[PDB]
Amino acid sequence: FIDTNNDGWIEGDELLA
Ligand SMILES: [La+3]
Numbered sequence: 001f002i003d004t005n006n007d008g009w010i011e012g013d014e015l016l017a
Pocket residue numbers: 003004005006007008009010011014
């Protein structure tokens with residue numbers, strides 16, 4: 001995954017792919 005706001009947790013739109 002790629003964390004799009006960079007907080008150290010994958011959630012929301014980050015999990016999409
Ligand atoms: La995040």
